[PDB]
């Protein structure tokens, strides 16, 4: 019977350890795909693989849950954990142990934690994890804007006055309210002065002094 | 987890002076306000919300 | 210094290519679809209110001087009247 | 006429709405007496209902359908050189899966992914049979007994119609071979269906390069022997005539490139129709248009076969588009490396016109760093603008680091710190920090090498090194002494070309030679500068303060920086002391590593190494022996002991020692004779010339690498070390150490597997030409680098 | 005392018989639950210790080979060639030299998790002994000898607990060594029957990828076929207490306390407690 | 490893005769492990033999006379020679000796001197037994084509294509004639019988069971020598049975079970078959009565059978023989005459049994 294994599948990480919560949990999914506990064990493999550093295989367990039933009542939990397994690939490594700034690393994991959090705060505004999703989007919108500042910081010492003014113009359209825009705003003024475009350098000079940090 | 998403700097939109209408704010990455009032930090409901019976 | 003219510096090209033959084929009274067809799309533009396209042709060889040819075209609200301002050399 | 009891307790095993409530018999009764014909033979005959039991009247009616149990697990027992991963992925798409209900139907679909899969590899006599095991109804699994068939054997290869070339020349260029000699390993009877179309296109391209433009292949007959033990295959070709190339014709819009294209497609008068030369000119025009902004051109070829005078011309229609500009250069895959490291090695600038010669220059620049394994350029396209591209680099990080902490404390030896911290990236910032804290029982060797490769934005480097030897050997006398050395180093390098690099800098070197044995080669230096002590006592101290000027030059054109297979790398490290130090000398050292392949797949790589060294004194100095040259051991001349190739100094007549308990190796005492007494250990010379030559072999019997790890090669290396200041007039019975002709040659086989946790290189060599006194060993092993 | 000092050159095959044989942790490590069908392993063994009279022992035992995972009914068959390039730097104070012990062979281990420890190891080692004496006018010496090995390993493992296991292992090998002559007094051909027994308290906790194996051992060495013509031979028993350790992670395949001591006898085998470490980042 | 079953053991020999007459001459270089159809022939007590290297010889039935060794497969006249895969089959009829090859060469040697060999280029590989009928040497190649050559120079070159199945087995079906209609076994399980004028109507008939099965490897194949009696074409095939059709272009068809690739002998009312399981059975011309089998030779790589002095002698894969009677098929007689093995078919005429081994060793055993 399938009930003799699920009755001993309550020893979680708070009761047992990080290893016993999977051994009797995997044996109920393969041998009973259409059993009694069909969607219960699918919401247990997601949480058990998050704190056991089982990051890539839990991402395949996320997209399986929306694909077979999109009419789930409390679907806000699987969408909130999709953003947490993408932020687990961020600066939580040996580089983060020393205390360095990893804003100029690969932004592919931080940008992947934005398309799912935008659907959570706009689709279900009165959900449970709506408050923590908005507070996590401020750090993600600041980490992605700081990556574009490190690009313009390299292109202003090598010297490229079309590549500098294209990243700050791309920062004024994507991230208009952050600290990296106000810091890269003198970098856009310096590239207009190195060329003969003095009519454009006075427009940036009238917006830095008008917004005193 | 970490303590970086709550200790970060808030967002403040800069202003535009006269002569520059600043129409560049027309892209993605917008943060709406949906009355955020709940639990933040480490004290969250990390357990899966299992559905009860009728 | 001593290493001012010894260290190798690669070619730093910027902006779009402006061949001197197809620059003088445009004139006033031209829509935006014909300027973007002959010279191409501009790499930079002015979004602050007006619509001015900057055709900057800048190239800098390794410690051998800087050459820049700037062509600024100021469009109108409809996008027909252009202001031809050709800068063949920088200061 | 309604039926009430129609829902009994034998239909709720696998479903309640799809099995019990599939047909609404309750409160949906319409027909009068056709209830048996509307449910049983209309719906309950296809899904899982095999029972066609005729229902009785309304007193003892019963359906009683027994549902067959589900499948628990597919245990593939007896994996006869097959993988369980590729045997179960085909069964999920075509066959059975885990936990799926099987109502005793699948007999043939299990033979579709298993028996027909044996028909593809060559096993035509497969007789597999899946029999279910006796077990109660809960999670019924089954056993899988494997009955293998015949191997994929090939009897012979025959090519008919080959009136021009012989049939033996074609098998030497065929990928699908028949028999291998003892010269190679691979090339035996392995019949693969995907490999049959591989060598058929090679036969199609073999005659196209010689001039047979009308070469056509008929149907290929793959015949099988009765009572199968081999597979025959016969091709039928119909070649034409060897044609001649008349001329080219480049049409279309050349976009001003009318002088570098027609000169590029120029042919030789009296040349045939080469098949590989048409596809080379098809790409070289596409490579030429990519160096000006045209990223996506359109080129074709219309060959005009003229069978009248046996000639052929070709017409190229070049359609060059518009100038494509680079909008953004994004990088993905740099998890541990910052974006500023991967941006300095880019020759294509953002916001300029797309030059394809500059993008491939940035791809090969990331390969020679040694930080990544696989790199590639995926040039995207902006959907809005018709002439804007997005150059995307997909890199993959490598574990650039080594933390060896193999310390251990013996019962009487003591503490044996072996800290071996050495990495090329500190935290992804380009800084190469190598800390070798090899602290032995007395040898307290500690160094710290921090090197910044980009001090400025142009590529100027700045590094440092702080060594500390502290080597106290107060037990043996095998050219050993109480040494104490330290000092710093400052090196500033800068590039002068795309591949060349120069460097310069200062350096302070301190030495302290205390309690050293007297011999000839060590006291010719002390008789030149310093004092002249007596030759019959020990503990003669000497402290030198050096101030050197370290120059050098480095040329690098390798294809990869991790472990290359093509290109050359020339190194040079020279130094000379400034006037005013304790000693006045100089030393030049050269290194060479040349990789060259002799095929197309880069499988046989010829490697040639060359190490040259020379050093002399300035103003009368005599080349201080703590910075001499040593040959032998491993990675220089494989087949000898560690630093044994070179001159061996004659020991002076001693008189005393530390204790002298009648077994010391000091001479001119009661244990030996009373004359000038020679030795057997190497002391090094002023010059050095070592040349090596290897042959990188194909994949050995150990064939598991999973990227490129294992590498087997056999080598042949020479080398000699001679003392250029040895006086030959005062010594007659001793061998002349001033002769640069005593070449020591060796040969053997090496094995280098580049695993990140055991990166050791072991090699077995046998010296066939050595000299007297040279201690030679056969097996050698170290870390390397 | 001239025959007893010259007997140290003849007493080099008795010490090499212990160095050529090893346990499972010295050739395969801990072969517990690895899904590798074929994998080359790295192993370098080095011992020291003065036996009697200050013997310089600096032998470096190395071995490398592959495996072949062939599971049928829980009784696997392994096949792979191994090499034995042992550089035995074993010499006294009176005579100097080394010993180049080159050899090659194969192994067939059928060990499983149930406790069926049946291994068949066969190897052929050709020894090269180069010594340079000074007493009694001997001087340099050079000969050649061969050695055939037939390692029949037995043992069973019962699981009394969930993590702590006990493996009473017994060894029974066979030798085919030969002798040599002098030219300026010879031995004969003997067949050793050196066997050992003792339990192995293996506290193997392979829960996560961090696999710690606190392995113990109280083995004892004895001789079955004892010869008395090397003058004559002598009797000597050995003690082989060894406490092993391993920590096999994906980034650390090292950090193992591998050591073995003795209590009685006139020989020294290894250090007391010393280990290694490595890390790749 | 073993595929299905190993070779069957040898039963007790009875040996009711004296087969002591056997002379051994190893001609050629040996065939080896190559599947061919190199069977000897005889004409006026002159035994002919060949090999894949081209060493064609001629011997006598008594001891071996008129020995001329010619290098037919040379193809090189500069420094050495080279084999041309001479694996067609020696047939002596009409004063000429026709041997096919696998390099599109159909040689035609002489009888007295045996060195003038005009060769005709064909569109494939000659593998079938070259038969003659009214001065026309029929060749069934490996490409599914029929090229009948003249006896003088091969002027007539009419060619008809029958079928070309994917992954066929062989194409060495020896054709027989019947009242002007040359019955040619196809390659995809079809039985064709056309007139030998220029190529008449084919009237193909599918007799194999490859169309019924979904996955097939080498099921559609027919390789037989359809000897006819009273105008009845038997023409068996792989995975079928005999297909006793009439000469009047009929469409009626009946097989039973279990057909092979080897040949058979028609003794009028009694026929004798072989299968892939290598059980020598016996049938009649109308259906079958007392179909007895012999399971003592299971998977022993059995060759084609032949009648000799009332007994059916069949070779083996190692060199043994099976002298089997006719009334029930229980008597056997195993003689260790060869060590390499028998692969080609044995021929027997006028009291002379000829069998060639894999190494090219002919025999004249008489019992």
Swiss-Prot record, chain B:
Q: Which organism is it from?
A: Escherichia coli (strain K12)
Give the protein name, as stated in the record: Outer membrane protein assembly factor BamC
Sequence intervals crossing the membrane: none
**Family membership:** Belongs to the BamC family.
The record's subunit annotation is: Part of the Bam complex, which is composed of the outer membrane protein BamA, and four lipoproteins BamB, BamC, BamD and BamE. Forms a subcomplex with BamD and BamE. The Bam complex has the shape of a hat, with the BamA beta-barrel crown in the outer membrane and the periplasmic brim formed by the BamA POTRA domains and the 4 lipoproteins.
UniProt lists the gene as: bamC
Where does the source fall among the domains of life?
Answer: Bacteria
Where does it live in the cell?
Answer: Cell outer membrane
Description of its domains: Contains two well-defined domains connected by a flexible linker. The C-terminal domain may serve as an important protein-binding surface for interaction with other Bam components or substrates. In addition, contains a long unstructured N-terminal region, which is required to stabilize the BamCD complex. Only the N-terminus of this protein is observed in the Bam complex in X-ray or EM structures, most of the protein must be highly mobile.
Curated annotation (Swiss-Prot), chain D:
Specify one Pfam family: Omp85
Q: Which UniProt keywords apply?
A: Cell adhesion, Cell outer membrane, Membrane, Repeat, Signal, Transmembrane, Transmembrane beta strand
Q: Where is the POTRA domain?
A: 1-68, 69-149, 152-240, 243-321, 324-398
Null-mutant phenotype, please? Deletion is lethal. Depletion results in the accumulation of incorrectly assembled outer membrane proteins, including TolC, OmpF, OmpC and OmpA. Decreased expression leads to decreased susceptibility to contact-dependent growth inhibition (CDI), and decreased expression of outer membrane proteins (including in this study LamB) as well as up-regulation of periplasmic protease DegP.
- Membrane topology, Extracellular segments: 411-412, 440-442, 473-481, 513-540, 578-585, 617-685, 723-744, 767-780
Reported effect of changing residue 717 to A? Slow growth on solid and liquid media, less protein accumulates which is more proteinase sensitive
Specify the effect of residue 228 to A. Answer: Lethal, protein does not accumulate
Entry-linked PROSITE patterns: POTRA
Q: Where are the transmembrane segments?
A: 402-410, 413-423, 432-439, 443-452, 461-472, 482-483, 500-512, 541-554, 568-577, 586-596, 606-616, 686-695, 710-722, 745-754, 756-766, 781-785
- Note the InterPro entries from the entry: Bac_surfAg_D15, BamA/TamA_POTRA, D15-like, OM_assembly_BamA, POTRA
Lineage, top-rank taxon, reads Bacteria
Cellular localization per UniProt? Cell outer membrane
Q: Which residues lie on this side of the membrane: Periplasmic?
A: 1-401, 424-431, 453-460, 484-499, 555-567, 597-605, 696-709, 755
Biological process per Gene Ontology, one example term: protein insertion into membrane
The entry sums up its family as follows: Belongs to the BamA family.
Name of the molecule in the record: Outer membrane protein assembly factor BamA
Give the originating organism.
Answer: Escherichia coli (strain K12)
Origin organism lineage: Bacteria, Pseudomonadati, Pseudomonadota, Gammaproteobacteria, Enterobacterales
Question: Which gene produces this protein?
Answer: bamA
Curated annotation (Swiss-Prot), chain E:
**Subcellular location(s) per record:** Cell outer membrane
Domain Autotransporter stretches = 33-281
Please report any disulfide bonds recorded for this protein chain, giving both cysteine positions.
none
Using the record for this protein, list the coiled-coil segments as residue ranges, or answer none: none
Hey, where's the site called Cleavage on this chain? Answer: 22-23
What does the record say about its membrane topology?
Multi-pass membrane protein
**What is the name of this protein?**
Autotransporter protein EspP translocator
Task: Specify the species.
Answer: Escherichia coli O157:H7
Q: Which gene encodes it?
A: espP
UniProtKB/Swiss-Prot annotation, chain F:
Q: What UniProt keywords are attached to this protein's entry?
A: Cell outer membrane, Lipoprotein, Membrane, Palmitate, Signal
What coarse category fits the chief subcellular location reported for this protein?
Answer: membrane
Keyword Signal (UniProt): yes
Checking SMART domains in the record gives:
PQQ (SM00564)
Q: Which InterPro entries match?
A: BamB (IPR017687), PQQ_b-propeller_rpt (IPR018391), PQQ_rpt_dom (IPR002372), Quinoprotein_ADH-like_sf (IPR011047), WD40/YVTN_repeat-like_dom_sf (IPR015943)
Q: Which GO terms describe its molecular function?
A: identical protein binding
Pfam families, per database record: PQQ_2 (PF13360)
* Record-level GO cellular component terms: Bam protein complex; cell outer membrane; membrane
One GO BP on record is: protein insertion into membrane
Task: Identify the PROSITE patterns for this entry.
Answer: PROKAR_LIPOPROTEIN
> Keyword Repeat, does the record have it?
no
Q: Which SUPFAM superfamilies match?
A: Quinoprotein alcohol dehydrogenase-like
Which compartments does it reside in? Cell outer membrane
Membrane topology field: Lipid-anchor
NCBIfam families according to UniProt:
assembly_YfgL, PRK11138.1
Q: What does the similarity note say?
A: Belongs to the BamB family.
> Subunit arrangement?
Part of the Bam complex, which is composed of the outer membrane protein BamA, and four lipoproteins BamB, BamC, BamD and BamE. Monomer. Interacts directly with BamA. The Bam complex has the shape of a hat, with the BamA beta-barrel crown in the outer membrane and the periplasmic brim formed by the BamA POTRA domains and the 4 lipoproteins.
Protein name as catalogued: Outer membrane protein assembly factor BamB
């Amino acid at each position: 019977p399938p009930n003799e294994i699920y009755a001993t599948a309550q020893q979680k990480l708070q009761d047992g350890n990080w290893r016993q919560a999977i051994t009797q949990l995997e044996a109920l999914d393969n041998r009973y795909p259409f059993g009694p506990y069909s969607q219960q064990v699918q919401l247990d493999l997601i949480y058990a693989y998050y704190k056991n550093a089982d990051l890539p295989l839990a991402q395949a367990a996320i997209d399986r849950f929306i694909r077979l039933n999109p009419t789930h009542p409390n679907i806000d939990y699987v969408m909130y954990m999709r953003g947490l397994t993408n932020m687990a690939l961020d600066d939580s490594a040996l580089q983060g142990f020393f205390g360095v700034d990893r804003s100029d690393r690969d932004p592919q994991h931080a940008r992947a934690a934005f398309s799912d959090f935008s659907k959570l705060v706009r689709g279900y505004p009165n959900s449970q994890y709506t408050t923590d999703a908005t507070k996590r989007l401020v750090f993600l919108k600041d980490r992605l804007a700081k990556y574009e500042y490190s690009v313009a910081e390299y292109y202003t010492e090598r010297g490229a006055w079309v590549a500098v003014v294209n990243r700050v113009e791309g920062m004024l359209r994507d991230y208009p309210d952050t600290q990296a825009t106000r810091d890269a705003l003198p970098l856009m003024e310096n590239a207009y002065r190195q060329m003969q475009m003095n009519a454009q350098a006075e427009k940036v000079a009238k917006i830095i002094a008008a917004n005193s940090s | 987890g970490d303590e970086a998403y709550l200790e970060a700097a808030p967002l403040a939109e800069l202003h535009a002076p006269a002569g520059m209408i600043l129409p560049v704010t027309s892209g993605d990455y917008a943060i709406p306000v949906t009355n955020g009032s709940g639990a933040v930090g480490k004290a969250l409901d990390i357990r899966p919300p299992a559905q009860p019976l009728a | 210094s001593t290493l001012e003219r010894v260290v190798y510096r690669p070619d730093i090209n910027q902006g779009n290519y402006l061949t001197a033959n197809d620059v003088s084929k445009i004139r006033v009274g031209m829509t935006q679809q014909q300027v973007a067809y002959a010279l191409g799309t501009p790499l930079m533009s002015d979004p602050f209110g007006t619509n001015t396209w900057f055709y900057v042709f800048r190239q800098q060889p390794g410690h051998e001087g800087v050459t820049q040819q700037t062509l600024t075209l100021t469009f109108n609200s409809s996008g027909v009247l252009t202001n031809i301002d050709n800068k063949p050399a920088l200061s | 006429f309604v039926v009430k009891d129609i829902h009994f307790e034998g239909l709720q095993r696998v479903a309640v709405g799809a099995a019990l409530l599939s047909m609404p018999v309750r409160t949906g009764d319409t027909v009068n007496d056709e209830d048996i014909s509307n449910t049983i033979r209309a719906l309950f005959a296809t899904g899982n209902f095999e029972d066609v039991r005729v229902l009785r009247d309304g007193d003892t009616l019963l359906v009683q359908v027994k549902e067959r149990p589900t499948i628990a697990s597919i245990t593939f027992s007896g994996n006869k050189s097959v993988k369980d991963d590729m045997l179960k992925q085909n069964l999920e798409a075509s066959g059975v899966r885990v936990g799926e209900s099987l109502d005793r139907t699948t007999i043939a679909d299990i033979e579709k992914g298993l028996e027909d899969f044996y028909y593809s590899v060559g096993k035509y006599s497969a007789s597999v049979k899946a029999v279910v095991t006796p077990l109660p109804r809960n999670r019924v699994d089954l056993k899988l007994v494997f009955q293998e068939g015949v191997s994929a054997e090939i009897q012979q290869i025959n090519i008919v119609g080959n009136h021009a070339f012989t049939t033996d020349e074609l098998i030497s260029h065929f990928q699908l071979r028949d028999e291998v000699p003892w010269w190679n390993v691979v090339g035996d009877r392995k019949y693969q269906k995907q490999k049959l179309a591989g060598d058929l296109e090679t036969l199609r391209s073999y005659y196209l390069d010689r001039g047979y433009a009308r070469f056509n292949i008929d149907s290929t007959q793959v015949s099988l022997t009765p009572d199968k033990k081999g597979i025959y295959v016969t091709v039928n070709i119909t070649e034409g005539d060897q044609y001649k190339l008349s001329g080219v014709e480049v049409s279309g819009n050349l976009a001003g490139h009318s002088a570098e294209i027609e000169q590029l497609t120029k042919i030789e008068p009296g040349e045939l129709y080469n098949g590989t030369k048409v596809t080379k000119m098809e790409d070289d025009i596409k490579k030429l248009l990519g160096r000006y902004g045209y990223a996506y051109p359109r080129v074709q070829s219309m060959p005009e076969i003229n069978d009248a005078d046996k000639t052929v011309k070709l017409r190229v229609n070049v359609d060059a588009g518009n100038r494509f500009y680079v909008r953004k250069i994004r990088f993905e895959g740099n998890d541990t490396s910052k974006d500023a490291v991967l941006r300095r090695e880019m020759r294509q600038m953002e916001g300029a016109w797309l030059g394809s010669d500059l993008v491939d220059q940035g791809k090969e620049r990331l390969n020679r760093l040694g930080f990544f394994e696989t790199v590639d350029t995926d040039t995207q396209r902006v959907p809005g603008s018709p002439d804007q591209v997005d150059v995307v680099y997909k890199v993959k990080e490598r574990n650039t680091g080594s933390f060896n902490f193999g310390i251990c404390y013996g019962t009487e030896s003591g503490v044996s710190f072996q800290a071996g911290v050495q990495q090329d990236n500190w935290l992804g910032t380009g800084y190469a920090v190598g800390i070798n804290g090899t602290k032995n029982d007395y040898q307290t060797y500690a160094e710290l090498s921090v090197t910044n490769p980009y001090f400025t934005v142009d590529g100027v480097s700045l590094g440092g090194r702080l060594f500390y030897n502290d080597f106290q050997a107060d037990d043996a006398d095998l050219s050993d002494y109480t040494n104490k050395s330290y000092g710093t180093d400052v090196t500033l390098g800068f590039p002068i070309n795309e591949y060349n690099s120069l460097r310069a800098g200062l350096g302070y070197v301190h030495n302290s030679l205390s309690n050293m044995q007297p011999q000839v080669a060590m006291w010719r230096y002390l008789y030149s500068m310093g004092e002249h002590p007596s030759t019959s006592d020990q503990d003669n101290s000497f402290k030198t303060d050096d101030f050197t000027f370290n120059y050098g030059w480095t040329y690098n054109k390798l294809d990869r920086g991790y472990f290359p297979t093509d290109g050359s790398r020339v190194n040079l490290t020279g130094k000379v002391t400034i006037p005013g130090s304790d000693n006045e000398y100089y030393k030049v050292t050269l290194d060479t590593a040349t990789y060259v392949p002799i095929d197309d797949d880069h499988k046989w790589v010829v490697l040639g190494r060359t190490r040259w060294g020379y050093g002399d004194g300035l103003g009368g100095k005599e080349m201080p022996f703590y910075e001499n040259f040593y040959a032998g051991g491993s990675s220089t001349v494989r087949g000898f002991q560690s630093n044994t190739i070179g001159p061996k100094a004659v020991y002076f007549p001693h008189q005393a020692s530390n204790y002298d308990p009648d077994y010391d190796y000091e001479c001119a005492t009661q244990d030996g004779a009373k004359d000038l007494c020679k030795s057997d250990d190497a002391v090094g010379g002023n010059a050095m010339a070592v040349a090596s030559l290897e042959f990188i072999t194909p994949t050995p019997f150990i064939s598991d690498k999973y990227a490129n790890s294992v590498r087997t090669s056999f080598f042949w290396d020479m080398g000699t070390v001679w003392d250029t200041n040895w006086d030959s007039s005062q010594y007659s019975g001793y061998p002349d150490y001033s002769d640069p002709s005593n070449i020591r040659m060796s040969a053997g086989i090496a094995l280098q597997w580049m695993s990140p946790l055991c990166p050791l290189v072991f090699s077995y060599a046998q010296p066939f030409k050595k000299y007297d006194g040279d201690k030679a060993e056969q097996f050698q092993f170290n870390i390397g680098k | 005392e001239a025959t007893r000092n010259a007997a140290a050159l003849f007493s080099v095959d008795y010490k090499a018989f212990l160095n050529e044989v090893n346990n499972l942790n010295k050739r395969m490590g801990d072969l517990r639950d690895i899904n590798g069908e074929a994998g080359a392993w790295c192993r370098i063994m080095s011992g020291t210790g003065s036996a009697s009279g200050g013997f310089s022992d600096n032998y470096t035992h190395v071995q490398v080979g592959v495996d072949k995972k062939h599971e049928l009914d829980g009784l696997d068959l392994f096949t792979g060639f191994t090499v034995t390039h042992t550089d035995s730097s074993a010499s006294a104070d009176v005579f100097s030299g080394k010993t180049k012990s080159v050899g090659a062979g194969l192994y067939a281990s059928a060990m499983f998790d149930s406790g069926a420890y049946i291994d068949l190891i066969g190897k052929y080692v050709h020894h090269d002994n180069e010594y340079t004496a000074t007493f009694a006018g001997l001087g340099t010496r050079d000969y050649s000898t061969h050695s055939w090995y037939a390692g029949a390993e037995a043992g069973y493992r019962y699981h009394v607990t969930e993590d702590a296991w006990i493996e009473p292992q017994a060894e029974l090998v066979y030798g085919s060594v030969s002798g040599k002559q002098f030219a300026w007094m010879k031995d004969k051909d003997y067949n050793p029957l050196i066997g050992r027994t003792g339990v192995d308290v293996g506290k193997s906790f392979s829960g996560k990828d961090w696999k710690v194996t606190a392995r113990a051992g109280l083995g004892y060495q004895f001789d079955l076929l004892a010869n008395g013509e090397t003058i004559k031979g002598e009797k000597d028993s050995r003690m082989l207490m060894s406490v092993g350790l391993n920590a096999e992670i994906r980034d650390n395949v090292r950090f193992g306390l591998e050591f073995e001591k003795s209590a009685f006898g006139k020989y020294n085998v290894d250090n007391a407690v010393c280990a290694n470490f490595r890390y790749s980042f | 490893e073993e595929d299905v079953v190993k070779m069957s053991p040898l039963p007790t020999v009875e040996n009711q005769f004296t087969p002591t007459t056997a002379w051994s001459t190893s001609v050629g270089s040996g065939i080896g492990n190559f599947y061919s159809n190199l069977h000897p022939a005889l004409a006026d007590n002159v035994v002919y033999a060949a090999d894949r290297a081209g060493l064609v010889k001629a011997l006598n039935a008594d001891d071996g006379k008129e020995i001329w060794s010619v290098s037919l497969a040379e193809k090189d006249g500069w420094f050495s020679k080279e084999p041309a895969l001479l694996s067609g089959g020696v047939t002596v009829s009409g004063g000429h000796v026709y041997i096919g090859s696998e390099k599109a060469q159909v040689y035609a040697l002489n009888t007295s001197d045996g060195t003038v060999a005009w060769q005709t280029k064909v569109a494939g590989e000659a593998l079938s037994r070259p038969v003659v009928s009214d001065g026309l040497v029929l060749i069934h190649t490996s490409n599914g084509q029929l090229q009948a050559l003249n006896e003088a120079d091969g002027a007539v070159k009419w060619t008809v294509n029958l079928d070309m199945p994917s992954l066929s087995l062989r194409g060495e079906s020896a054709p027989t004639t019947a009242f002007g209609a040359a019955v040619v076994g196809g390659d995809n399980g079809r039985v064709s019988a056309v007139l030998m004028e220029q190529g008449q109507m084919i009237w193909q008939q599918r007799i194999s069971q490859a169309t019924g099965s979904t996955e097939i490897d080498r099921l559609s194949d027919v390789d037989t020598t359809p000897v006819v009696v009273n105008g009845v074409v038997f023409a068996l095939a792989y995975n079928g049975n005999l297909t006793a059709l009439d000469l009047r272009s009929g469409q009626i068809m009946w097989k039973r079970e279990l057909g092979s690739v080897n040949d058979f002998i028609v003794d009028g009312n009694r026929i004798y078959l072989v299968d892939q399981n290598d059980r020598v059975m016996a049938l009649t011309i109308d259906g079958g009565v007392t179909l007895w089998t012999q399971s003592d030779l299971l998977h022993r790589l059995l060759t084609s059978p032949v009648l000799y002095n009332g007994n059916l002698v069949v070779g083996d894969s190692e060199g043994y023989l099976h002298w089997i009677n006719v009334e029930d098929g229980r008597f056997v007689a195993q003689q260790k005459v060869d060590s390499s093995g028998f692969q080609t078919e044995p021929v027997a005429a006028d009291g002379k049994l000829l069998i060639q081994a894999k190494d090219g060793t002919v025999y004249s055993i008489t019992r």
